[model samples]
Target: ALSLTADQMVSALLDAEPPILYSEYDPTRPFSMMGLLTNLADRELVHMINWAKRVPGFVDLTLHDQVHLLESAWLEILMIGLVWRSMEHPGKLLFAPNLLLDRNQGKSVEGMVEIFDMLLATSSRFRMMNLQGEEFVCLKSIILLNSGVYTFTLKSLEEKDHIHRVLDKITDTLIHLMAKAGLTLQQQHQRLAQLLLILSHIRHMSNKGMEHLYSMKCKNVVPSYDLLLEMLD
Candidate 1:
């Protein structure tokens, strides 16, 4: 449903003048139930915290760390085909973008900016994998029932083919996420007109460059991006 060039779409997506990363913060500092589980004191606490924030955890963590984790986790499973899970609560829900960014920051663009960074990072992670595996699972479930986990069948050639089909479904979902959140239907002709515009910009800048793609685990199910996107939406 999109008519934009892949390069243009990618360019617009990468160069999008969204918001700065990390500096955005909430002054009200609302309390989060999951933040308590982060265990910042652990020797590898940052890693755990980062993982918690990215995987659509039920609670919120620092914004910068969350995006970093999401990007890294996406790569591990999508491009490199690795399978993994945070040692903590496997049932935990990741912070989704729509849940946070789509909502105007208690009153500042700063809040929206944080959402932008997270969303862009989320988008980049998928672009790297071209929207494969875990992302496949998450996108499908979200569109149909609101949320789902990333799982895959790596058992045989047939299983791999099935995984391929799942990935195809996700491409549609990714475009849908951008469209649903990007702009009003009146602003463009196509359903994803504005959405594609933003994504195109993002993919152009070196920020979304393939070399910059995050690599962490094998592509199976529930990539960090898909989980984060679904939760927020």
Candidate 2:
């Protein structure tokens, strides 16, 4: 049997020292733990996500735009769900792909929560590179587009096209990266299939268009989408 208690396991999982390599401080100097634990946790999370996203093709572009693109897509997902797609500034900054995320669900917090849970779960696959001040979260760069939030909720074909439009650029970049990674055409096809599955998962979840951000039990895979968003609290 696993002799570890829930609290014990969590503590162990999050347990980490200041620096695995070297430390600037002597044995003791008030032990300024500023960002030490968070940084370590960040490293673990990034490694998890990156490993899951790995593929033979589209290595460079995926690696290159990994950070910025993911952030953009996440923000876009939030915007689309919260606001109106045909709002005044339809051509504005975060308004480009309004159809997929921005449709009126009447109330689809369930869907939102489900996607959020997936994001958190998959986050364990990303890898992290520690620098002076910033920690870079690196994925496999097999992204068809941002690999942020997979949107398929909108009821409009036009909105779906817009989503694909964003994905196209992402796909092109990923393919280029894969080729640069020295994958044969056959290998590329294999990698493409894997990446497409990833995209499909997102689209499917989005199409369900029901929010379920339930509370997480910390020990379970997914607790409850309703509890997560405080919808039932």
Candidate 3:
């Protein structure tokens, strides 16, 4: 992994910058809940691919493991991005100004009650944390590197450790940023646990999101994108 300082690494990781006006969604025409999901999934997959390339040793992993990690972690990263763009709207999720959704609208989507509840809960917690850009990006990287119960095999210890080191460095930087923000030591510890807890919630949310996607696929209402299905798989 690269020996970048916390700030440097943060800058590098976020260098691509999220789209200011994400064109993946259409506000002119009405879309179903599944339509919104299709757009989110498509854009996030593109972002994940680009984002992974910037991580110091991500490309060094076996192609299979790389795909596994991205697939496993895509929804977590998507939620983080959603929350990041949502800072302006306290309880609302804004895919676009015209495409915004409040909790009621979120719950109205089929199979989304559980997922929306998690999003709203996480959004509330994150708002309380008042995370900075660097802190947000670090947390994002940590999620991206996590190795969940994977469908693909990642048997290389060296590759796992390599990813782990990147995760640790970003985590250290997250701590540094949190402390620099003037939290008490006790508060920092509390924040750390709370942040990790948010991630645990996201894992639950991701599983629920997968179930919803699978239902869409079964109904043949899914978008025509093999890449999106691959990421979900």
Candidate 4:
């Protein structure tokens, strides 16, 4: 009964934007860039959990399935947030509204340089495209749902059908959004393909993030909180 109609889905996603109030960086916290990032990622993880609930058709699923989907999409969703947050500030990464990091500042954190470089690179790519907010909301829905393609393919067949139907509705909405932006048919094809390509980039980052976090876990490099540990599991 809960179809992901475009108009409502757009409004839902827009309304669910995380209310990240800025706080000044505390110099006395004995921060490592990696540690601060872990803290920030944990904080963002909480926001995303609440935001996901408001997503059209998201709460319609069983609670267990909801957790399953979110767990699968966790890293990618956070990556999307980073890319969105840093869109305006070129040559820097906005880990949070207040936690901005420049290229040079990121160099000193052990294990942070490569992750920062990759994330900062992706942020620049998004900047180049002038990625609009509406576009981001649509892509967010797709990535949240598409993680099932990776998780539910060989198992979870029942939820798979439900998601594909939901996916159908959202993609149709994406097409609607494109037309509304006045893209010609050919132009839409090209742009849509390019837009979807960001998924591959996000997915690659998700894997790399898990790998890096695993390394951090082994070395006790940062204090990952319970929620962060849960999602990482």
Estimated TM-score per prediction?
Answer: 0.21, 0.28, 0.83, 0.85
lDDT, candidate 2, 179-216, per-residue tens: 76678989767765654554445444444432321242
- What are the clash counts of all predictions, listed in order? 42, 39, 0, 0
The reply for model 3, stretches above 4 Å from the true place, is 20-31, 149-155, 218-233
Question: Which has the greatest TM-score?
Answer: 4
Alpha-carbon local distance difference test for all models: 0.32, 0.33, 0.69, 0.75
Candidate 4 has its poorest 10 consecutive residues by lDDT at: 220-229
Q: Give the TM-score of candidate 1.
A: 0.21
lDDT score of residue 231 within candidate 1: 39
Ranking by TM-score: 4, 3, 2, 1
Which residue segments of model 1 deviate by more than 4 Å?
A: 1-156, 168-233
Q: Per-residue lDDT of 1-233 in model 3, one digit per residue for the tens? A: 55888778777767845553454545576666657666666655665677776776677777666776776887777777777777767778765555667778876676666676677667777777776777777777778788442333246777777777777887777777778889888988888887887888778877787777776546443233355445433
Angstrom error of the Cα, residue 125, model 3: value is: 0.9
Name the better of 2 and 4 by lDDT: 4
Please identify model 4 stretches exceeding 4 Å from their true place. Answer: 1-4, 21-31, 153-155, 218-233
Kindly list the per-residue Cα lDDT of model 4 for residues 73-191, writing each as its tens digit: 88898888878888888888877666788878877866667777788888888888878898888888788878855654444676677778887777777777889988898888787
The per-residue C-alpha lDDT of model 1 at residue 96 equals 25
